[PDB]
Design a protein around this ligand. Sequence first.
Ligand SMILES: Nc1ncnc2c1ncn2[C@@H]1O[C@H](COP(=O)(O)OP(=O)(O)O)[C@@H](O)[C@H]1O
Lengths: 68, 456, 109, 177
Amino acid sequence: SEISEIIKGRIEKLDVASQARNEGTIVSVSDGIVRIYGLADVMYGEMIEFPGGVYGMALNLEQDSVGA
Amino acid sequence: SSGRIVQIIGAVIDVEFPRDAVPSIYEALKVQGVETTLEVQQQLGDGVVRSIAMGSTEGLKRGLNVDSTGAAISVPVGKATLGRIMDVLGNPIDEAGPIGEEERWGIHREAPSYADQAGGNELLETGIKVIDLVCPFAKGGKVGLFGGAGVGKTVNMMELIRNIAIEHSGYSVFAGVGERTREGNDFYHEMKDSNVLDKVALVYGQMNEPPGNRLRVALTGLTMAEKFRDEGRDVLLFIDNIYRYTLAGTEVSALLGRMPSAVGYQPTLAEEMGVLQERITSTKKGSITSIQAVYVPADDLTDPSPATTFAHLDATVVLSRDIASLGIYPAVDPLDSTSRQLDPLVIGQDHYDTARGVQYVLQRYKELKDIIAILGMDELSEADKLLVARARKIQRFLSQPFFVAEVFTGSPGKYVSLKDTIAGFKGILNGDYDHLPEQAFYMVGGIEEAVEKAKK
Amino acid sequence: SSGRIVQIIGAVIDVEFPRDAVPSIYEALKVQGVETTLEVQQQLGDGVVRSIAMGSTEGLKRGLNVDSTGAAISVPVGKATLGRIMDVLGNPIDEAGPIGEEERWGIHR
Amino acid sequence: AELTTLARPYAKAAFEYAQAHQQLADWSAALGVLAAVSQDDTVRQLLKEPQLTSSAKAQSLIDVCGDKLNAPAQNFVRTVAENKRLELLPTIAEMYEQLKAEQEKSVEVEVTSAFTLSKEQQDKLAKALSARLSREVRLHASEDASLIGGVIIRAGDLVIDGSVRGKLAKLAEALKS
Ligand SMILES: Nc1ncnc2c1ncn2[C@@H]1O[C@H](COP(=O)(O)OP(=O)(O)O)[C@@H](O)[C@H]1O
């Protein structure tokens, strides 16, 4: 490709997290709705564990977010 | 090539494909490893299609592989569908093994063309006297069916199935749109006990199913009726409610995010009615005649769902509680049932004169019944008393024993031809049978059976 | 750490905070230099919270520094409230001086 | 909205700066390196992380690209990232190239053929297309076994079909009707 070797060597030392498919991060909380980045293996109707013993249910599996 | 699920919102599933292998509108898709079928509704761009699932989506995830079948939803057709219960995908839902079909057909096709119309206004003989006299059916026609429950709707449907199978060498297809599961099991056992199960193919789209199943189940039953029409036959197609087909279109259009039309309906209401109703016609090979029961919302005839439905109907049959409380079966109101075929250019002058004479005598008896109720029988003249006697004879001669009701009446059933119906009601209207008692005219076939009933 | 006002549309005010110091839902916030309190309704993502003012928005600008109190709107309770007129924030709106309460309670329970 | 609708004022601002300061090839190399860096999967995973600010995403893109960006291109990267428009970075570069093709009076023409064409045949088609379009043309030749003869010229939305497959389709439409 047209990527140079030095630019590729700068790309390989980037700090990129390895996102597990059963893990996610909360983006937004509003009115009982929690929209979550990630969770790439979640099913429609699957329970989701939050901290503090709080549980949720996934209902909107969108392209880049999950509404629970 | 296969695609991947990118979005699950309810029953609406978006699947991404490669750009040279985007599947067509109304193509059936299969989720790998699961028993789930999808039907493509829209092409959104960048390889992504938006589709409706034909079952429950609980347990589906993004990332599942989806195969394309290359065609629309294809159902089994032919003689092997008779006696069997099927869903919208044509899979059997009775526990009686696979359907042994020889042919599968897709459920989306065009209406028959302008040059393929059969022409004329040929009548379909049902063998029922009140139907063939007062509200006659056309081949290729459509029948609205009105009334509540418990007045004999199912018995009339089994008698139409038996009469079209035995006397005309045709078949029947039932399509239950929004079928209650209790009543479908009851209707299946009633058709086993009346020996008419092997004359009809049953397709149910049940109430607890998502609304694309309840949208496409009439197209499945119409596809099986089209194969039966293309074998050269005259087919009956029964639709259990046309308003649930309309409401399933409202629900599917609300799930896709379309902007709604007046009184809440889908903006494609007349078009989705016309795609279903223009396939029910008389062609050069054979005909399909449909009997469709109609619910009216809020008792409003100018609501958009019955106003779109009544533009396609050729006849109405109204069932009445007051005729059934008198013991007269079938309980068809002769004054409230209408027909577009009741016209002297269509059926001739003789049938029209006999039917309008019967309707005048029953209407005059209807107002004189309130006169007798307000002031007594002594208020009426000799001509009014003569019309009351002829009208009670006409009202009892409209009753008829049925072959599927022999447990109920305790009699053999009768099939009456149209010639015998016009000759018998003309014989009552001309005063030829005023010497008979009225109870001879109850539950016989032709007028000669009433003549031999009045010797006993 | 403090945030800054990014949007004022009517009674609804959006405040951007740093990502380690986002206030919770129903946290009270104090705008610096103007006597107005904000209550957090929603967390919109990227550090931004959406809130409703507990006063008039005529003296507010974009760019104003907003501090977080770390708790909900707390009002005085006890028998010091008897005989007094208070507003929604528990400040006295008679002219009888300060309320000498011994306990304050949050309004969300 | 479409990607070109969103990518139009960024490419127009970059083209007006690079035409005003005589840095057309510098910004064309910079936007090509930026588009190719933003389409790599690791950078695309980094640019969709929710805990990163827009300034850190612009700083990571500037530190990855390095010596291929001058200081106004870095200012352009910070303006693109502050308005949350980093996914537009291929489309912006494409529209910049279209603007530069209107400035130097040139058109990029794709020619597909049934057999390989020599330099005399490409110079002949390029001179005919330069006489028709009133632009300097740049041909890009390619092969196709679907054609049985002839060439197909594609220049933007202009299609000139000289292949015998199209003449076969015209004869099929003329005899079917
Ligand atoms: N042809 C008939 N002869 C005698 N009785 C009938 C006839 N048709 C219907 N009935 C009576 O009416 C009742 C209701 O019939 P049915 O068709 O089962 O209505 P539904 O299907 O709405 O319950 C039956 O139980 C039967 O007793």
